[PDB]
Coordinates of C-alpha atoms and ligand atoms in Angstrom, one line a residue:
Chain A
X1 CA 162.3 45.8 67.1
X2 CA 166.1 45.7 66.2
X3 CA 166.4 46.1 62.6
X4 CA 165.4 49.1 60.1
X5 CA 166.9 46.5 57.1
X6 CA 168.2 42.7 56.4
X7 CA 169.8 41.8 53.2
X8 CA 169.4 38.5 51.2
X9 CA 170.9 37.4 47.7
X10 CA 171.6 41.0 47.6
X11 CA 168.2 42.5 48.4
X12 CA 166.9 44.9 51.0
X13 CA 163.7 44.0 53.0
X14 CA 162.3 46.7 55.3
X15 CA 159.4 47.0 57.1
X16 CA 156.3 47.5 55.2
X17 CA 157.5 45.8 52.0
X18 CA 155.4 43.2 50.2
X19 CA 157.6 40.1 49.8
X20 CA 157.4 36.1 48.7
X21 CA 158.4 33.7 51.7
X22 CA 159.4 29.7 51.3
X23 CA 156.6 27.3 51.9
X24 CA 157.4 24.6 52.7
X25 CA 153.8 22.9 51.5
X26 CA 154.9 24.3 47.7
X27 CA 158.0 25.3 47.5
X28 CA 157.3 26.8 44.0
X29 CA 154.4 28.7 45.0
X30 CA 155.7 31.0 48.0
X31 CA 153.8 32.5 50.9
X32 CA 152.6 36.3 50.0
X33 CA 153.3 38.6 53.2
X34 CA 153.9 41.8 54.2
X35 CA 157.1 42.4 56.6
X36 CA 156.0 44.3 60.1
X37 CA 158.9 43.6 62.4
X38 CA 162.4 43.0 62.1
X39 CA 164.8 41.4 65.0
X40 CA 168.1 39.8 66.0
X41 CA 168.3 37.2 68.3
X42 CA 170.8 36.2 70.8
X43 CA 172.1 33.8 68.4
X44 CA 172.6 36.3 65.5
X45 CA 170.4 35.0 63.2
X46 CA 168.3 37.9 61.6
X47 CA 164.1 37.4 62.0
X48 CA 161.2 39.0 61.0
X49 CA 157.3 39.2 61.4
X50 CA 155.2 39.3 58.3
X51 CA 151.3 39.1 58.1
X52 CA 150.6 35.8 55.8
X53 CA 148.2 36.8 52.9
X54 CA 146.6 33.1 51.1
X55 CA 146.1 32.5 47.5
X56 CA 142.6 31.2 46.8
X57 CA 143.9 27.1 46.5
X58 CA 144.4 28.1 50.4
X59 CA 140.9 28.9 52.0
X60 CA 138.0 27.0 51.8
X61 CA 135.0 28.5 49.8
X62 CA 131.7 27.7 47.9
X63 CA 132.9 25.8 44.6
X64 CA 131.2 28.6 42.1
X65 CA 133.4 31.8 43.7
X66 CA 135.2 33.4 41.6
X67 CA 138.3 34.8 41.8
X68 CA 141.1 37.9 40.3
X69 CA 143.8 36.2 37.9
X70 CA 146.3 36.7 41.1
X71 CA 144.2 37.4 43.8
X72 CA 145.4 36.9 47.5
X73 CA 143.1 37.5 50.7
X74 CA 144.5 38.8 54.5
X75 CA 144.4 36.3 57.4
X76 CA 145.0 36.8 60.9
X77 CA 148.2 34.6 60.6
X78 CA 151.5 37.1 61.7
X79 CA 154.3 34.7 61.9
X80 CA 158.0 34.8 62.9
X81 CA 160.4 33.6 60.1
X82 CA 164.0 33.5 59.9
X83 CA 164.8 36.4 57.2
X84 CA 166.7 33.7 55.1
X85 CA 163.1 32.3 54.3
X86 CA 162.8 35.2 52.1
X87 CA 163.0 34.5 48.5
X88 CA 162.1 37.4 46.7
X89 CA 160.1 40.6 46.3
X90 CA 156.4 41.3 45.1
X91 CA 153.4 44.0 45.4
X92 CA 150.5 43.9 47.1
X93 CA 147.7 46.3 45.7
X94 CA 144.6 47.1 47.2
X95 CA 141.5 45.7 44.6
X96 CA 139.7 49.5 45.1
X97 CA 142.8 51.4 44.0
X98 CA 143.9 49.2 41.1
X99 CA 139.9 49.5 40.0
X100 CA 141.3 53.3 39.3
X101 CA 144.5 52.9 37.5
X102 CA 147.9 51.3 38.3
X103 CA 150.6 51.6 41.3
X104 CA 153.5 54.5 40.3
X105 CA 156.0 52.2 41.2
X106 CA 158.5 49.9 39.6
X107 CA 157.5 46.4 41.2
X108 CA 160.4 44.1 42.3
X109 CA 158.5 41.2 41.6
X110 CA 154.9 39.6 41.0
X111 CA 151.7 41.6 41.4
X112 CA 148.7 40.5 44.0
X113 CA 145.4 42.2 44.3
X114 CA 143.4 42.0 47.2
X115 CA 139.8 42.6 48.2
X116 CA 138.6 40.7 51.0
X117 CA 140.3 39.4 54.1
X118 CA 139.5 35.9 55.0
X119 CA 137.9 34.4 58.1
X120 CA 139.9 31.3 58.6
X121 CA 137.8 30.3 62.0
X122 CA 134.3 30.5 60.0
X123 CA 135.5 30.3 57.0
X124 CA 134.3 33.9 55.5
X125 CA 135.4 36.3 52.9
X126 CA 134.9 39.9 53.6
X127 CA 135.6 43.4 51.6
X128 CA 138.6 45.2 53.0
X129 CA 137.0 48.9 52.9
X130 CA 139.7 50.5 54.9
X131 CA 143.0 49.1 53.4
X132 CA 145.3 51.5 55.9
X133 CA 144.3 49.5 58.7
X134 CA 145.7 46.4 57.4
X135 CA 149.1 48.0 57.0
X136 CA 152.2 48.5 59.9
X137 CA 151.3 51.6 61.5
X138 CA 154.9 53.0 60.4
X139 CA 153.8 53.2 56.8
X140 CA 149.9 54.3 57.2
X141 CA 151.2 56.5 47.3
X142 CA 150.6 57.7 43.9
X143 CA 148.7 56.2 41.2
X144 CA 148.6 56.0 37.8
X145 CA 145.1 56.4 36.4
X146 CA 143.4 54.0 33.5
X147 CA 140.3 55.0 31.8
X148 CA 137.3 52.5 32.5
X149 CA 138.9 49.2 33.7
X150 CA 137.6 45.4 34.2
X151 CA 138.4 42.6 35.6
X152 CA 138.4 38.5 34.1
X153 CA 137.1 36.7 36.8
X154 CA 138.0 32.7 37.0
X155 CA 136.4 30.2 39.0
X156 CA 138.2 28.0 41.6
X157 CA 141.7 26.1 41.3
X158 CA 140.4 23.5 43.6
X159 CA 136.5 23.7 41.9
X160 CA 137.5 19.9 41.0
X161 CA 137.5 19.1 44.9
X162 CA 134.1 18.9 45.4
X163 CA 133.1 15.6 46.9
X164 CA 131.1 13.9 44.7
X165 CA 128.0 13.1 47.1
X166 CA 127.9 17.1 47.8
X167 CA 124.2 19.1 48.6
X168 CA 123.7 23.5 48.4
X169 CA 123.4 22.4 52.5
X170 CA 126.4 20.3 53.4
X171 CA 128.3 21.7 56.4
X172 CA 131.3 24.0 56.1
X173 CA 134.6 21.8 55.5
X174 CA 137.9 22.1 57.1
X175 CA 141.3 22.9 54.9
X176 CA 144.0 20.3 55.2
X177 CA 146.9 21.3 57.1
X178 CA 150.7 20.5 55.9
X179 CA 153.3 22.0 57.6
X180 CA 152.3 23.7 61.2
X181 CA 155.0 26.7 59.9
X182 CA 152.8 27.1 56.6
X183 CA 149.8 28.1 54.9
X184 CA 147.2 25.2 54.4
X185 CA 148.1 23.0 52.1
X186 CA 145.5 22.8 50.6
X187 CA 141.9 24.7 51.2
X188 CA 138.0 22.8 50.3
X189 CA 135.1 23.6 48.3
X190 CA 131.6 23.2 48.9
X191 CA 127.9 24.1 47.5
X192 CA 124.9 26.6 48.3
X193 CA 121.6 28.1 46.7
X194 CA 122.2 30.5 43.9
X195 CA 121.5 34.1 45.0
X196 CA 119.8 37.2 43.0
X197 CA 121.8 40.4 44.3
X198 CA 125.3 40.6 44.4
X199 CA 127.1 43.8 45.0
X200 CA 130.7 42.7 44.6
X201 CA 131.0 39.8 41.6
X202 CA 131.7 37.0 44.4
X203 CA 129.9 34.5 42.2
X204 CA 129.2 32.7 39.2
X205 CA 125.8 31.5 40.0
X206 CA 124.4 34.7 40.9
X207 CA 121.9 36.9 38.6
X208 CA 123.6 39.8 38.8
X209 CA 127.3 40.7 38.6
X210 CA 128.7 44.4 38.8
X211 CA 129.6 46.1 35.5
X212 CA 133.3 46.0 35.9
X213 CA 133.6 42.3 36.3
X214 CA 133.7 40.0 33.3
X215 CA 132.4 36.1 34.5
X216 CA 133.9 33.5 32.7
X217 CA 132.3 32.8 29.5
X218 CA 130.7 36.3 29.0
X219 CA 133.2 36.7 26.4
X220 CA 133.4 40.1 25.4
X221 CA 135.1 41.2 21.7
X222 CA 136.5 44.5 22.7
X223 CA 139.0 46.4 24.6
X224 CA 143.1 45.3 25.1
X225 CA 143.6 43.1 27.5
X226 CA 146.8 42.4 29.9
X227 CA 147.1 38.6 30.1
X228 CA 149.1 39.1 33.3
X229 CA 146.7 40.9 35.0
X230 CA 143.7 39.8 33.7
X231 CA 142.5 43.5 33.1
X232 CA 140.6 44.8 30.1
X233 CA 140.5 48.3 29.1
X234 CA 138.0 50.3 26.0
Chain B
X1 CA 159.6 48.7 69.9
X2 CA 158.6 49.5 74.0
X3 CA 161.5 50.7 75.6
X4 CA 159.3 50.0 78.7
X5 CA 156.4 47.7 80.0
X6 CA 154.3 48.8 82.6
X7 CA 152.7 46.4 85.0
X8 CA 150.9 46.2 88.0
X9 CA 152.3 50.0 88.4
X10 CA 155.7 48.0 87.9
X11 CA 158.4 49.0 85.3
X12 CA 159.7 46.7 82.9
X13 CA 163.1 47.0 80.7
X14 CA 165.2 44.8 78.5
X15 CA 167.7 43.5 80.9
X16 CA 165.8 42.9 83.8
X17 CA 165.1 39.9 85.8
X18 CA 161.2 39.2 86.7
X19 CA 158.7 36.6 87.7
X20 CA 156.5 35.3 84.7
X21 CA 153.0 33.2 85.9
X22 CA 153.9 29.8 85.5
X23 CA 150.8 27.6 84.4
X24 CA 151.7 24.8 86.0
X25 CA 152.4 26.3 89.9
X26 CA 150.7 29.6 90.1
X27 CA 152.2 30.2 92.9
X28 CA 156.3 29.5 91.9
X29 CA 156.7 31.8 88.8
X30 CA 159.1 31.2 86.3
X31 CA 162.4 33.2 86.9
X32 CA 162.9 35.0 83.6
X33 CA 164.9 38.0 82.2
X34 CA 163.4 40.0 79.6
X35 CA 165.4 39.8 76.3
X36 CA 163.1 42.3 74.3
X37 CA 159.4 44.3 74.0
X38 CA 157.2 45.0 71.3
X39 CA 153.7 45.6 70.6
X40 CA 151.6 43.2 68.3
X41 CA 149.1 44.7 65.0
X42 CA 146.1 44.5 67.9
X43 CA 147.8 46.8 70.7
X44 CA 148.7 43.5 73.3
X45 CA 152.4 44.5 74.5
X46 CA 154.9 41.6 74.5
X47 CA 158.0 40.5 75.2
X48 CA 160.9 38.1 75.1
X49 CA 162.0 35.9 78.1
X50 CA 164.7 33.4 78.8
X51 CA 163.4 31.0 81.1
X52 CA 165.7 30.1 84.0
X53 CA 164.8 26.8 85.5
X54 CA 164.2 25.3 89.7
X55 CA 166.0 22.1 90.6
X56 CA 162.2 20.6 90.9
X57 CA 162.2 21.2 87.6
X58 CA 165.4 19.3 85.8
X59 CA 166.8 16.3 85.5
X60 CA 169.4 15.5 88.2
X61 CA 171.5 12.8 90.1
X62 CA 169.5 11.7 93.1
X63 CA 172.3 12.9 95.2
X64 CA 172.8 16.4 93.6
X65 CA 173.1 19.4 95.7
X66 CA 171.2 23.0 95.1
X67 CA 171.8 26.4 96.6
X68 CA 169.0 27.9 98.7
X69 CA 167.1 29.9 95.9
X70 CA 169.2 28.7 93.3
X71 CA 168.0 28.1 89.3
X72 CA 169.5 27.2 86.1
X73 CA 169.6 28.9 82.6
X74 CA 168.3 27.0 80.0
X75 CA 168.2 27.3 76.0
X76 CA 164.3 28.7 76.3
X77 CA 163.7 31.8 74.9
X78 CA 160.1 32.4 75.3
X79 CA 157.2 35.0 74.2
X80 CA 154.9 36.0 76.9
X81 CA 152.1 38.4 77.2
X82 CA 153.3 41.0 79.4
X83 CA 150.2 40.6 81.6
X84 CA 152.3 37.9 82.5
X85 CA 154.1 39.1 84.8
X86 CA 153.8 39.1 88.1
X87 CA 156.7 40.6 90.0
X88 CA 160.5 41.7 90.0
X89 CA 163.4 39.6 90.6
X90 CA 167.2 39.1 90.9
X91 CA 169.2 36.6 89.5
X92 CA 173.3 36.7 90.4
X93 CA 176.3 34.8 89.3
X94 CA 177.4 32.4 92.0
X95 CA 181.2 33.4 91.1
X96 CA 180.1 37.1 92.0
X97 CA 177.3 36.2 95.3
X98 CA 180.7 34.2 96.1
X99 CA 182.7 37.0 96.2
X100 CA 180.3 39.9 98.1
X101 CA 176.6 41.1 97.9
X102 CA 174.7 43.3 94.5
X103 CA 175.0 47.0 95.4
X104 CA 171.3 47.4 94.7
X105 CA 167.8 47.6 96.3
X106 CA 163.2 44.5 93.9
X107 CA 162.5 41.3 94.7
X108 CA 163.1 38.0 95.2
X109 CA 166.8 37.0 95.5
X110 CA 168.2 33.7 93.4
X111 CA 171.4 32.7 92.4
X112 CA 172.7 30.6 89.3
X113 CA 176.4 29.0 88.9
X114 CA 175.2 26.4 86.3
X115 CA 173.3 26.5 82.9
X116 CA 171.4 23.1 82.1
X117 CA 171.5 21.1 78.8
X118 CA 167.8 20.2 78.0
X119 CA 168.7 17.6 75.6
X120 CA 171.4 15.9 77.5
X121 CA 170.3 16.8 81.1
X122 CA 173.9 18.0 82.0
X123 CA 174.5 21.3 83.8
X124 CA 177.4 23.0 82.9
X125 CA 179.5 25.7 85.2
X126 CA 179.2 29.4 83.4
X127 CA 182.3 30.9 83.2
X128 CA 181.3 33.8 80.7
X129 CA 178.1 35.5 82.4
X130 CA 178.5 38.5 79.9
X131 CA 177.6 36.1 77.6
X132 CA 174.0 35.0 78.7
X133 CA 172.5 38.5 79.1
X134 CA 170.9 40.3 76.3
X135 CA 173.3 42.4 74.1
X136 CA 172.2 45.3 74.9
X137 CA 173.8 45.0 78.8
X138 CA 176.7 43.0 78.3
X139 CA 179.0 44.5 79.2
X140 CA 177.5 46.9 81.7
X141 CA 179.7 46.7 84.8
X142 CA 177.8 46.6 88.1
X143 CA 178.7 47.3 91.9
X144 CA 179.0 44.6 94.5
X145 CA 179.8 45.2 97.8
X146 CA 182.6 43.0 99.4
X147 CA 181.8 40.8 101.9
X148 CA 185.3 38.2 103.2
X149 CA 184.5 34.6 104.5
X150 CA 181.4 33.6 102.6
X151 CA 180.4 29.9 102.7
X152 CA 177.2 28.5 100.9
X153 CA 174.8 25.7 102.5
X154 CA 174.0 23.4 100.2
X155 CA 170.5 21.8 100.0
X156 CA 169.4 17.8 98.8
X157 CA 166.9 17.9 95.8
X158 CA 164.0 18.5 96.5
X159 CA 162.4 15.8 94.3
X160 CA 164.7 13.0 96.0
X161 CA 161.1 11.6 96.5
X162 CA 160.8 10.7 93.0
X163 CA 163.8 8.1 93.1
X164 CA 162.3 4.5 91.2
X165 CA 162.1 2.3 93.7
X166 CA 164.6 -0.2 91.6
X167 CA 166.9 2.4 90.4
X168 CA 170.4 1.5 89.8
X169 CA 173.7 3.0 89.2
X170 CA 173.5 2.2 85.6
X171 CA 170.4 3.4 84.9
X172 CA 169.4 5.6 81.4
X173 CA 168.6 9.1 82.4
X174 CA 164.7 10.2 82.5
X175 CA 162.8 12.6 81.0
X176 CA 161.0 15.4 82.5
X177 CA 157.0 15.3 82.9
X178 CA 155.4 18.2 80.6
X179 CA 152.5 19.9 81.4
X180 CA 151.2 23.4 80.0
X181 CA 154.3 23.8 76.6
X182 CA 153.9 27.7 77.5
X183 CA 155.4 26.5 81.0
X184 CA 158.8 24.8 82.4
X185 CA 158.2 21.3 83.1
X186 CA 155.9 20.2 85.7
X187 CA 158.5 18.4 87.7
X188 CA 162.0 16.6 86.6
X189 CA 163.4 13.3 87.2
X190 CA 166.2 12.1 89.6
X191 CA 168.5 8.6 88.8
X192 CA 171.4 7.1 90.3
X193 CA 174.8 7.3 89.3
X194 CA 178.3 5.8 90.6
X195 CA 180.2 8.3 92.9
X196 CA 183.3 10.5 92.3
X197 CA 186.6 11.3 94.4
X198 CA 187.0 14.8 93.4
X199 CA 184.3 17.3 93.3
X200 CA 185.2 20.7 92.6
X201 CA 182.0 22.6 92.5
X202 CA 180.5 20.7 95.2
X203 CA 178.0 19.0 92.9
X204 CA 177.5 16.1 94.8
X205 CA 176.7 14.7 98.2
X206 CA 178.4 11.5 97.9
X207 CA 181.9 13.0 96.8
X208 CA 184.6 12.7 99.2
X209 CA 185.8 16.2 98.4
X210 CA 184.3 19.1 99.2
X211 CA 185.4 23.2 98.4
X212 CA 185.9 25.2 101.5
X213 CA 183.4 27.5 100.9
X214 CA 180.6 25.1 100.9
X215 CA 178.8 23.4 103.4
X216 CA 177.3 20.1 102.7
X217 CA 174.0 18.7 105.0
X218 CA 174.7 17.0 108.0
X219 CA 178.4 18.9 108.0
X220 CA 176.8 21.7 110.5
X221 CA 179.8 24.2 111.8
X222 CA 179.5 24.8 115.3
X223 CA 180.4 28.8 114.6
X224 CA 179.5 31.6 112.4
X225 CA 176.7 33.9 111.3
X226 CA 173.8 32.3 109.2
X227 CA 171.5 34.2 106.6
X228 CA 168.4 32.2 106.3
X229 CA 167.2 33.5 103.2
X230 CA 170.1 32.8 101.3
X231 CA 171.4 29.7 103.0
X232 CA 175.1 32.0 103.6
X233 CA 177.1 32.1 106.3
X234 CA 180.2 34.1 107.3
X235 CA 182.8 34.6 110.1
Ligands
LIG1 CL1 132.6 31.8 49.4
LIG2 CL1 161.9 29.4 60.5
LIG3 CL1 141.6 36.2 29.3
LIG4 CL1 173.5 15.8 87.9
LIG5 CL1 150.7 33.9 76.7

C-alpha cells in the first residue's frame, strides 16, 4: 500500500492490470496474475501482490475435460513478488462476456479466458458467476459485440499422463510441486463414469454438450474461425 | 492501505512499537515495530513487523553482558495477522536512554544499543537509528527529557546455563534451536571465547576495561539512586 505505479523495461503496472510473471518451473510459459497491491520496502526494492491464475497443465483433472484454446482458472494463491519478476502484459477476460463479443480495448499482450476457479485443496473446478468479486475492490468496461459465437474445445495437455493401470474410481491424485515460489509444475489426470447432462461443455465423454461449444472432432464446415482464439463465428 | 489497526480497543500505526504473540513463549511476546498495514482480498487486516530479538534468544559469548529489558534488531521483517497483537511497547536507542528519559506516556519499556547479524551471530553498535525505523518517521525528531549522571547495570546472559560442558575458547560458534518459523528462535546458544583488554561498549564481563557509565555484576556502588525496572541508577 505504497505505490499507485512501478515501471519495468519501460512499462507501467498498476493495480488491477492483468500481467505475465517469471516462473521459475517454465520460464517460457509465465505465471498469469492480476496485480492487487503495490509496496516498497525498507530496502527499496519495489513489490507487489498478484492473485496467481493456472493454465490447465497446472491443476489436476479428469483426463476427458476439456478445455478453451487459452484458458486459465483462479486459485486462492495471492503471492508477494518482487516487481522485476514481471515480464510483460496480458488480458484476462471473463468466459460469459467474451460469449457476447470482444473486450474494447487494445491488449498489451496475450489473451486468457476464464470460467471456473479452481479448488486446489479438493481438486474442483467451478463456474465463476460473479466475475466482480474476483477483482481488487479498487476496480469493481465496454464491449464489442459478435453475432452468435462458439468455442473449439481441446482436450487435456497432460491427457498422456494417465497412469497406465488407471480405473473411472481411482482416488484423486496430487500435482507435483517445483519451486515453493511457483505454480505446480506440473498438474495429474485421472478417470470417472461418463455422465448424461452437462450444462457447461466440461467434457468429452458426456451426452450432451451446450450449443456454443464445438468438441473435438465435431468438425463443423462453416463459419470463420480465429486460430488464436479458437472462436468460430456464422 | 489501513492507516490504523484497531485491537483489543488499542490503536495501531506505522511507526509504532508493540508486542506480537510469540508461539513459542506465550507469555514473552516478540518486540516488534510495525513497518506497514493492509487488508487482504478476504477482509483479515495485516501488517508488517520487524522483529527485535531477547538475549535468550541469540547467539552470544558466554560471558556477554545485557541491559535490564534490553533487545536487539534483527534483519526479520515479518507479516502477522493483526490479531496478533497483544499490547503496546517502547523500544529506545541506548545512546538517547543514555543521555535522559522519552517525553512520553504505553507499555513496556526496552532498550536497544546493538543490531544482531543472524548469519554471523555478531551484534553490531547502531550509530544511525534514523536508519532502522520505517521511512515514513525517520526523521521525526522526538522529546527527551534530560536526566545528568546516568549509569546502566549490566546483567549475565541469561542462558549462561546452556554453556557445553567441554566448551573451549576455540570453539565454532552454534546455531540457535528453531521452533515455530512464524516465531524468533526458541532459545540461542552461548560459546567461549579468549578475553580482551579494551572494551568500549562494555560487552563483556571478562574485559579489564569498563565505561564509566556502566556497572558491571559484582561491581555494586555503595551510593546512588536505583530504578529497578530499568536496571539505572543516578547520583
Ligand atoms: Cl474435472
Ligand atoms: Cl521474489
Ligand atoms: Cl481449430
Ligand atoms: Cl558476543
Ligand atoms: Cl499469522
Amino acid at each position: 500500500p505504497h505505490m499507485d505505479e512501478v515501471i519495468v523495461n519501460n512499462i507501467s503496472y498498476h493495480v488491477g492490470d492483468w500481467a505475465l510473471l517469471r516462473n521459475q518451473n517454465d520460464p517460457q510459459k509465465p505465471i498469469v496474475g492480476q496485480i492487487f497491491r503495490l509496496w516498497k520496502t525498507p530496502d527499496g526494492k519495489q513489490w507487489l501482490n498478484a492473485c496467481w491464475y493456472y493454465r490447465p497443465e497446472q491443476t489436476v483433472h479428469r483426463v476427458d475435460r476439456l478445455f478453451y484454446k487459452n484458458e486459465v482458472m483462479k486459485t486462492g494463491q495471492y503471492r508477494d513478488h518482487l516487481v522485476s519478476n514481471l515480464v510483460g502484459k496480458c488480458y484476462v477476460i471473463h468466459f460469459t462476456r467474451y460469449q457476447r463479443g470482444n473486450p474494447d480495448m487494445k491488449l498489451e499482450g496475450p489473451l486468457f479466458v476464464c470460467e471456473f476457479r479452481y479448488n486446489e485443496s479438493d481438486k474442483i473446478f467451478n463456474k465463476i458467476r460473479t466475475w466482480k468479486a474476483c477483482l481488487p475492490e479498487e476496480i469493481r468496461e465496454a464491449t464489442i459485440p459478435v453475432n452468435g459465437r462458439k468455442f473449439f474445445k481441446y482436450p487435456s495437455p497432460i491427457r498422456h499422463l494417465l497412469p497406465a493401470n488407471a480405473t473411472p474410481h481411482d482416488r484423486v491424485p496430487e500435482p507435483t510441486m517445483g519451486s515453493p515460489d511457483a505454480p505446480p509444475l506440473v498438474g495429474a489426470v485421472y478417470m470417472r463414469p461418463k455422465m448424461q447432462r452437462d450444462d457447461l461443455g466440461e467434457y468429452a465423454t458426456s451426452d450432451d454438450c451446450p450449443r456454443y461449444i464445438i468438441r473435438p472432432n465435431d468438425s463443423p464446415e462453416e463459419g470463420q474461425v480465429d486460430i488464436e482464439t479458437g472462436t468460430i463465428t456464422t
